Amino acid sequence: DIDEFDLLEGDEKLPGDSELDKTTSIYPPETSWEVNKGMNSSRLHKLYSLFFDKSSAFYLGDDVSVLEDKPLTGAYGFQSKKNDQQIFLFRPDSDYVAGYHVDAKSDAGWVNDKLDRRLSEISEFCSKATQPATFILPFVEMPTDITKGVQHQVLLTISYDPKSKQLTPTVYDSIGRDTYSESLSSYFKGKYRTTCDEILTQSIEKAIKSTDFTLGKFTRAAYNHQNRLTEGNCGSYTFRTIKEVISSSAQGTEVKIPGSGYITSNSYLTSQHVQDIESCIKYRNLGVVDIESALTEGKTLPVQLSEFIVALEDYGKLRSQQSEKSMLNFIGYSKTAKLTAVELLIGILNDIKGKNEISESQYDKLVKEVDCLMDSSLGKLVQFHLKNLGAESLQKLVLPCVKFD
Amino acid sequence: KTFKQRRTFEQRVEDVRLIREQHPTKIPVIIERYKGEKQLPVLDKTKFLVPDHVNMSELIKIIRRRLQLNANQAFFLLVNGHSMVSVSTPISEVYESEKDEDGFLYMVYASQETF
């Protein structure tokens, strides 16, 4: 016999094609993703793993420690190291959604039931709070009275000061392209809704109405007006702003933003920040339980060999599935060479994982394929994992496991 | 309770001394469960007979089969107090290496590598 368990499953499982929008237990490597390709609640949640990585541009561990309890459902609690401020970050949810009507003559639209539920829970927590708190909820807003609407990334923050019993909402909005239309604006001759501000503020007031609370000035803090961005980018800005809100709230300084306090957008969302985001989304394979683990205990999640394997399976799947434009006078490796190398490497890594051993001719074959494994995008994937697995190279990764002769 | 308690050394010695050539090929193996192992089922048949050219790999596979679970949870086979950094070792060389004074090759299994 030959194949027993060369099976790729358990932590080496790559989710199937029909599990693609249905899988909330695991955030798989998406190896062709780019900041420009957009966000959803699962990628955002995945990105949360960066907060306690000390080597991330997004590291929070100087500003906050972890809340000893879990007083707020759906949220990760944090205690400022420089403040009395407690800070709650809601776990991203695809139901955190507000529709609005572009036409001012129609009503303000609606807020998803779960989002309104969260506002009520925030209010009930505040009524019992003895300490100043900040609540950070990522969400999306969409026009419902035009066809071809886009779901627009946006972020909500609420602070509660118990001394003045005041509760202050703010929305941070990274402006995307076509989040506005001159045609519409002209047709409505100016009474035009470009945001969910109306129904959302109404919601927040409806949530606090029975309590002692005063509603602070509601603020929409908008940025990147012309740095003219794809909807895609806006999600990355949202994540960056989650970071800024947390740090600024723990240091008790005003939240500073491109266009207010930051000199350029990419001084805010920095190429380093972008590489961090991209590498997390493209190259890593992370459980929900692992992320909840990280955030609730305040610790890094070390990259695991199985993630390297799963990433390789995704790069492999993508290229085998598709049909590339096959172009001429081509410098560099063919699709076929690369897929052969990937398959070789997956087999070798999985052999190392299960059997803790590698044949010497296996090692010889690997050695023949290493340059192809190191080239281009594949090279960037391999390099991410080599780096995080603490190996100087494929050879120096694999070599302790080879049985010679 | 263990096979060394159930058969005397003399008895064991005559078991090995011949089941050896009524299967001249084969090598005798006692696989038992680590006494402090909380997480793994107890398969019972202790005494096993294995073909020689076989390496530890396949043996691990069949014991992983009678234990009914999925290859995805940790399994380790220790030989005496000692065990493989190499799973490609033929059970013959392992036998000549780690065999007991009574002639049986003893192996114990666990979900962990503990002392």
Distance from CA of A397 to the nearest CA of B (A): 17
- Answer yes or no: are the C-beta atoms of B33 and B7 closer than 8 Å: no
Q: Quick one: closest CA in B to A350, which residue? A: B72
Shortest Cα distance, chain A CAs vs residue B65, angstroms: 11
Q: Which two tokens stand for residue A267?
A: 């001084």
| Catalytic choice (A53, A63, A93, A173) | A173
8 Å CB contact of B88 and A403: yes
Q: Which residues of B touch A356 (CB under 8 A)?
A: 85, 87
Report how far residue A137's alpha carbon sits from residue A88's, in angstroms, rounded to the nearest whole number: 9
Q: Which of B71, B86, B87 is nearest residue A5 as measured by Cβ atoms? A: B71
**List of chain A residues whose C-beta atoms are within 8 Å of the C-beta of residue B86:** 357, 403
A4 vs B87: CB contact, 8 Å cut-off?
Answer: no
CB A111 within 8 A of CB A142: no
User: In terms of CA atoms, which chain A residue is nearest residue B74?
Assistant: A354
**Contact in structure between A34 and A278 (CB atoms under 8 Å):** yes
Active-site residue flag, A152? yes
Strands A219-223 and A166-174, bridge-based pairing:
parallel
Residues of B in contact with A354 (CB under 8 A): 71
Q: What is the DSSP string of A160-183?
A: EETTTTEEEEEEEEEPBTTSS-HH
- Nearest residue in chain B measured CA to CA from A12: B72
> Given an 8 Å threshold on Cβ–Cβ distance, is B71 in contact with A403?
no
Task: Tell me the sheet residues that pair with A76.
Answer: A89
* A356/B87 CB distance under 8 A: yes
Cβ B61–A403 below 8 Å, yes or no?
A: no
Which chain B residues are within 8 Å of A358, Cβ to Cβ? none
Strands (E) across A91-213 are located at 97-100, 110-111, 133-143, 152-161, 166-174
Longest CA pairwise span in chain B (Å) = 40
Contacts of residue B57 in chain A, CB cutoff 8 Å?
355
Backbone angles phi, psi at B21, to 5 degrees: -105, 0
Nearest alpha carbon to residue A237 among A248, A251, A224, A225: A224
Give the Cα separation of A319 and A32 in Å (integer): 10
Please tell me the distance from the alpha carbon of residue B44 to that of residue B56, in angstroms, as a whole number.
Answer: 20
Other Cβ atoms less than 10 A from the Cβ of A264: the count is: 11
* Resolution in Å, one decimal place: 2.5
First to last CA, chain A: 22
Q: Does B113 touch chain A (CB under 8 A)?
A: no
Nearest by CB: B57 against A7, A9, A355: A355
What does the longest C-alpha to C-alpha distance in chain A come to? 82
Method: X-ray
Dihedral of CA A27/A30/A35/A38: which sign?
negative
Residue whose token pair is 């590698």: A358
Residues A51 and A333 sit within 8 Å (Cβ to Cβ): no
Helix (H, G, I), strand (E, B) or coil at A114: helix
From the list A45, A53, A101, A152, the catalytic residue is A152
Please say if A290 is a catalytic residue.
no
Q: How many beta-carbon pairs under 8 angstroms link A with B?
A: 20
Q: How far is CA B55 from CA B52, B68, B87, B93, B113, in A?
A: 8, 21, 7, 9, 20
DSSP letter for A49, please: G
Tokens of A45: 């949640």
Q: From CA A165, how far away is CA A126, in angstroms rounded?
A: 9
Tokens representing B22 are: 């009524």
Distance from CA of A291 to the nearest CA of B (A): 22
Per-residue burial over A158-182, b = 16 or more CB atoms within 10 Å of its CB, e = otherwise? bbbbeeeebbbbbbbbbbbeebeee
Q: What is the DSSP string of B37-73?
A: --SS------EEEE-SS-BHHHHHHHHHHHS---S-S
DSSP secondary structure letters along A272-288? HHHHHHHHHHHH--EEH
Q: Is B22 on the interface with A (CB under 8 A)?
A: no
DSSP A389: T
Nearest in space to A11 (alpha carbons), one of A272, A305, A297, A278: A305
Contacts of B88 in chain A (CB under 8 A): 355, 357, 359, 403
Residue showing tokens 């969910």: A196
Q: Looking at domain B1-115, which of 3.40.50.12780, 3.10.20.90, 3.40.50.300, 3.30.1490.20 is its CATH number? A: 3.10.20.90
